[PDB]
Design a protein around this nucleic acid. Structure first.
Lengths: 340, 174
DNA sequence: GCATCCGTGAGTCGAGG
DNA sequence: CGTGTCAGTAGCTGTCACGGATGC
RNA sequence: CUCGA
């Protein structure tokens, strides 16, 4: 399953969020399977069938109201008959008030159970009417209804593969000139946010490299000598953390291949793809998003990017400073020595 | 119908919303690694989907069957593969870094062998450099140089002693 | 339109564990 | 291999200045 | 971990 490079999603500012004009939190919900995103919608087919789908939705709302009012009448008449029966029995009027308040409580529940169904059908129709690409649907049941009803009209997806489709269905030159039009004449409050967006978009336009590289289909493995596994004088073994990170990526990617082959429920496959995303995110930059993958002893494992960061990184520790033919000892004053 | 296949997917998503988060906590205590607990949850619920007998009776607690499957998965992880390796991390302190000796002794021998080699005939030098430097067989050198089998054996037999003469004359230790 | 919050940085060398 | 009554982290905040993207 | 300038 495709996966995103954590350097361009979680790294500030979010390079993907600047390219697709998507908020960082909305992008977090998409990649990690918390919200679907609309990739395409057949807007002309929707227009040529809007009148028919509107009448069917109106008929469905009418049948929901007719069922509510019928159920409420049967309950209200049963209440009035029970009170009249407990009055013929001669029970105290305070006991009738208990049966009265219970009936009013039951009718309130019936009316509310119907109103919730009416409000869902209002959101289902509202969402399908104003459906455009790059829209997010955080409610999973709502998206399930949209596919069950108007699935012929739109195409949505989750996870990283969806963003891979949004980058594919993305006009680099048009979005570049659209930002330029805002930049030429605009308000500095809303123009500065468009300037920095052009900084990311214009880079993909001129250079000739596709933004598709921010989503990975294959991850490279660093040669073994750079992540060596050494034997210990106690007979046991000590290995580099990178081997654990690669191992967890391999374990979860092979499990995903099993679920795809077995046709397991989409809830297991999606919740597995999310874990594969977090594993590759830890391999490249563990700890960047959320809590870091701890090893034995609550110790955060080092990632590939940790080999280059800070004073202990490759640059400062092994490139800016490194030597043979050298020594050191204590210094003592020598008055007789000459200055040279 | 197609709704019957979708009812099975809405059934798995149901037991996810009632048991996954509690099963993750249980595996989290037995392993201590959150990334490992997620792997145990996915594998436990995968076996629940493969066993309709556990998903059949709702009047029977399926939670208890999950804790037992996860427990057995965790103890199996705790065997041989973890036994040897899990101990040390090179990134972690307290582990000695690997080192490789210097090539001084090898470079000095190579310099003395290169001097003794120069004092050899072009025939002997071109035979020891094809047997020890190229590692060919006796018949392979005989095929290349267009000479007899015993000719390569004899040239090698002398050239080795010729080199021993030059080295012992320069004081090379036996 | 602005308060919030995230991520960045924080001496060099040496000894023994 | 099969698995089926409660069955649910450790650890921890005793850093801070500073800037700018992120967010109600 | 602890120490030296």
């Amino acid at each position: 399953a495709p996966v995103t490079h954590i350097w361009y999603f979680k790294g500030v500012p979010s390079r993907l969020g600047y390219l697709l004009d998507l908020a960082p939190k909305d992008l977090e919900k998409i990649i990690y399977f918390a919200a679907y995103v609309i990739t395409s919608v057949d807007e002309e087919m929707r227009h040529n069938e809007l009148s028919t789908l509107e009448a069917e939705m109106a008929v469905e709302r009418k049948a929901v109201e007719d069922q509510r009012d019928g159920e409420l009448e049967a309950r209200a008449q049963k209440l009035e008959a029970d009170l009249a029966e407990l009055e013929a029995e001669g029970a105290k009027a305070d006991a009738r008030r208990k049966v009265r308040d219970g009936g009013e409580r039951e009718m309130r529940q019936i009316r509310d159970r119907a109103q919730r169904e009416l409000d869902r059908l209002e959101d289902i129709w509202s969402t399908f009417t104003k459906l455009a690409p790059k829209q997010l649907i955080v409610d999973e049941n709502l998206y399930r209804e949209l596919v069950d009803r108007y699935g012929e009209y739109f195409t949505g997806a989750m996870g990283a593969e969806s963003i891979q489709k949004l980058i594919e269905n993305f006009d680099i030159d048009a979005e570049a000139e659209s930002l330029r039009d805002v930049i030429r004449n605009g308000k500095g409050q809303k123009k500065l946010r468009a300037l920095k967006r052009l900084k990311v978009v214009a880079a993909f336009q001129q250079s000739g490299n596709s933004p598709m590289g921010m989503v990975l289909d294959a991850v490279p493995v660093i040669p073994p000598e750079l992540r060596p596994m050494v034997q210990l004088d106690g007979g046991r073994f000590a290995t580099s953390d990178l081997n654990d990170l690669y191992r967890r990526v391999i374990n979860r990617n092979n499990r995903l291949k099993r679920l795809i082959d077995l046709g397991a429920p989409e809830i297991i496959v999606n919740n597995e793809k999310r874990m594969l995303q977090e594993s590759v995110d830890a391999l490249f930059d563990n700890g960047r998003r959320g809590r870091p993958v701890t090893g034995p002893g609550n110790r955060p494992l080092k990632s590939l990017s940790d080999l280059l960061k800070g004073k202990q990184g490759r640059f400062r520790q092994n490139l800016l400073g490194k030597v043979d033919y050298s020594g050191r000892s204590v210094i003592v004053v020598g008055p007789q020595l000459k200055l040279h | 119908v197609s709704g019957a296949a979708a009812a099975e997917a809405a059934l798995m998503r149901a037991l996810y919303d009632e048991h996954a988060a509690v099963l993750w906590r249980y595996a989290l205590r037995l392993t201590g690694d959150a990334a490992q607990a997620e792997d145990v949850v996915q594998e436990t619920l995968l076996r629940a989907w493969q066993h309709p007998e556990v998903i059949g009776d709702t009047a029977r607690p399926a939670r208890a069957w999950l804790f037992t499957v996860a427990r057995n998965m965790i103890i199996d992880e705790r065997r041989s593969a973890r036994f040897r390796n899990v101990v040390g991390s090179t990134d972690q302190s307290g582990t000695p870094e690997q080192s490789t000796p210097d090539e001084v002794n090898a470079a000095l021998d190579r310099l003395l062998i290169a001097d003794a080699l120069a004092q050899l005939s072009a025939e002997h030098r071109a035979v020891i450099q094809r047997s020890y430097y190229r590692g060919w067989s006796t018949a392979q050198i005989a095929t290349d140089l267009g000479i007899a089998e015993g000719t390569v054996k004899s040239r090698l037999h002398y050239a080795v002693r010729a080199l021993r003469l030059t080295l012992q004359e320069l004081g090379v230790t036996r």
